[PDB]
């Protein structure tokens, strides 16, 4: 039984965004919605086996905010290059026409942890049946993230996952068809 | 390009054999650079770069802090394992196996944990095999495509299966 | 539903 539990937290400027999540063997256990101040379980079935007072996370965050100001003054506010993500799109299961499936947009090896993602069906943004994850930690300093698109496989529709980051010159789009 | 400033911390609880041997690793990152560590095997803070030195100086001079730190291997790392060992550790999701020709393809999807063995039988074939590798789905399930170059049986072994699955 | 433990962030400066 060789396992790893990771309490990953951070604060980012100038976006003024924070995060507090837990990680088990690479998968998110939960995170805390800072604005709504509540524990969001990655899988709904987790709630029956454990609990976490969200207050602690907001507290840590506030301290992260404080520490960040410290770190900025210590380094003379010395900025650093951005690291652009590698985007990959693939279905969750073997794709069958007419059979409900799921598209996975995988954004990996990037930082800072802030990106805008847009699902495109036939060039048009999609706001229905779209899920996303918070910024997940890797072994290294860089981040990871998943976006999900619910769909019905047809030969007429084509999809794109558009990812915008400060490390990129222009928004990066990865394509996917049934062909 | 555009400047950014990240205070990033990872508090890692490692378990070599369940609660047998537990290790706490606190890792501090600023922007792209890891600058400070607390390894429970060392019991002290250790800067990784110039930037983490002041912190190392400060916290290591706080006896009670270091004291409470060393205890967190038990107060936090042990405490949590006993909790997760109830649902996370013993998690098992059976894989779904499908064979189809694009070059024959064995599709092993929707399974947990990650460890799995996918073998091609023609007698077993150790040639003309390429795979996407293990792919994490982000939702506590894995998937992988193992393909046999042909011009046929697919066997799957996994902790969720008492007996192996075939084609 | 036991309560999960966590490290309280430490003060810098």
């Amino acid at each position: 039984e060789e396992h790893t539990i990771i309490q990953a937290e951070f604060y980012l400027l100038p976006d003024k965004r924070g995060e507090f999540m837990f990680d088990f063997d690479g998968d998110e256990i939960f995170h805390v919605d800072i604005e709504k101040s509540e524990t969001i379980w990655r899988l709904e079935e987790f709630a029956k086996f454990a609990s976490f007072e969200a207050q602690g996370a907001l507290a840590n965050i506030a301290v992260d905010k404080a520490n960040l100001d410290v770190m900025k003054e210590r380094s003379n506010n010395t900025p650093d290059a951005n690291v652009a993500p590698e985007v990959t799109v693939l279905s969750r299961s073997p794709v069958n026409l007419g059979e409900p499936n799921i598209l996975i947009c995988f954004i990996d090896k990037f930082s800072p942890p802030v990106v805008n993602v847009t699902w495109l069906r036939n060039g048009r943004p999609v706001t229905e049946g779209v899920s996303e994850t918070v910024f997940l930690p890797r072994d290294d300093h860089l981040f990871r993230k998943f976006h999900y698109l619910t769909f019905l496989p047809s030969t007429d529709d084509f999809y794109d996952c558009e990812v915008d980051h400060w490390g990129l010159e222009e928004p990066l789009r990865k394509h996917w068809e049934f062909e | 390009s555009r400047p950014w400033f990240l205070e990033y911390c990872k508090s890692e609880c490692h378990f070599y054999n369940g609660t047998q041997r537990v290790r706490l690793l606190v890792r501090y990152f600023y922007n792209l650079e890891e600058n400070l560590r607390f390894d429970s095997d060392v019991g002290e803070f250790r800067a990784v770069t110039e930037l983490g030195r002041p912190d190392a100086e400060n916290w290591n001079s706080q006896p009670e802090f270091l004291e409470q730190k060393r205890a967190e291997v038990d107060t936090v790392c042990r405490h949590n394992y006993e909790i997760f060992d109830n649902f996370l550790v013993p998690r098992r999701v059976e894989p779904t196996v499908t064979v189809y020709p694009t070059l024959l393809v064995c599709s092993v999807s929707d399974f947990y944990p990650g460890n799995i063995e996918v073998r091609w039988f023609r007698k077993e074939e150790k040639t003309g095999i390429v795979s996407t590798g293990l792919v994490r789905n982000g939702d506590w399930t894995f998937q992988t495509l193992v393909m046999l170059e042909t011009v046929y049986t697919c066997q799957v072994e996994h902790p969720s299966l008492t007996d192996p699955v075939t084609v | 539903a036991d309560l999960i433990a966590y490290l309280k962030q430490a003060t810098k400066g």
């Epitope: 976490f52 007072e53 207050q55 602690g56 907001l58 507290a59 506030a62 301290v63 905010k65 404080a66 | 916290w59 706080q62 009670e64 802090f65 004291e67 409470q68 730190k69 060393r70 205890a71 967190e72 038990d74 107060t75 936090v76 405490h79 | 309560l3 999960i4 433990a5 966590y6 490290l7 309280k8 962030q9 430490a10 003060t11």
Partner: T-cell receptor, first 114, second 107 residues
Framework: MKVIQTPRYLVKGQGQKAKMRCIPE?????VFWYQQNKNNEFKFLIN????????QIDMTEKRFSAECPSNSPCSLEIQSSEAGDSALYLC????????????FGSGTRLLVIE | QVEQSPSALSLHEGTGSALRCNFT?????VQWFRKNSRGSLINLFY???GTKENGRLKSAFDSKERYSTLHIRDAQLEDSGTYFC???????????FGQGTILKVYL
């Protein structure tokens, strides 16, 4: 220094605001406020690291007003005193938010009368 | 929650006894205070593990077994007052107190 609370005693009629002052140890950024009654039962009210609130209860949010202004003593003010606000208000400081090594002050003994 | 025993104690000079705190969960550490006649909480102990001796008092703490003890030896008038144990569950930023022990040293 040490945790210094003033006034050591306080008395107010219902409806009046009752302010309480607290000065943490030297170099102690974290400040806590607890409430203890005559039955020796304690209740966490609010928590600070320097100027920013780390956590508070629902009561403190509505009925209390608390600050830790820079270069200034942390304060805790009841906006409209009730008989049930009568208790000992303990303030405690800490060096490190990670740490659980708290130092309590003398406290302020508030009494609310008609 | 914290079960602190006992409720009250009377000790003739130069005698000894023990206080105890039992916990219903994992604490990050423990702390013992003494409220003197003034009502000022004198800090007595902090410990996240093991034991500590400070004069005529010694304290122990075992987070796994969820208990802490405060021993007093060679009691003196100055020892009178109400003793309290206090601990943070490792799941919170908040402290929890015992009911306290009223100690009284008979001269």
């Amino acid at each position: 220094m040490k945790v210094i609370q003033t006034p050591r005693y306080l008395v107010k009629g219902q409806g009046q605001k009752a302010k309480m002052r607290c000065i943490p140890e030297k170099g102690h950024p974290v400040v806590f406020w607890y409430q203890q009654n005559k039955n020796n039962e304690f209740k966490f009210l609010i928590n600070f690291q320097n100027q920013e609130v780390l956590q508070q209860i629902d009561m403190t949010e509505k009925r209390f007003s608390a600050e830790c202004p820079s270069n200034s003593p942390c304060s805790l003010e009841i906006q409209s005193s009730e008989a049930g606000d009568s208790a000992l208000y303990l303030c405690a400081s800490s060096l490190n938010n990670a740490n659980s090594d708290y130092t309590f002050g003398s406290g302020t003994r508030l009494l609310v009368i008609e | 929650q914290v079960e602190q025993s006992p409720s009250a104690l009377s000790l003739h000079e130069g005698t000894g006894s023990a206080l105890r705190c039992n916990f219903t969960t994992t604490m990050r550490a423990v702390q013992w205070f003494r409220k003197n006649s003034r009502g000022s909480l004198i800090n007595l102990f902090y410990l996240a593990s093991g034991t500590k001796e400070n004069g005529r008092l010694k304290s122990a703490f075992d987070s796994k077994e969820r208990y802490s003890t405060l021993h007093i030896r060679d009691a003196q008038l100055e020892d009178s007052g109400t003793y309290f144990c206090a601990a943070e569950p490792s799941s919170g930023q908040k402290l929890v107190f015992g009911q306290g022990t009223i100690l009284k040293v008979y001269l």
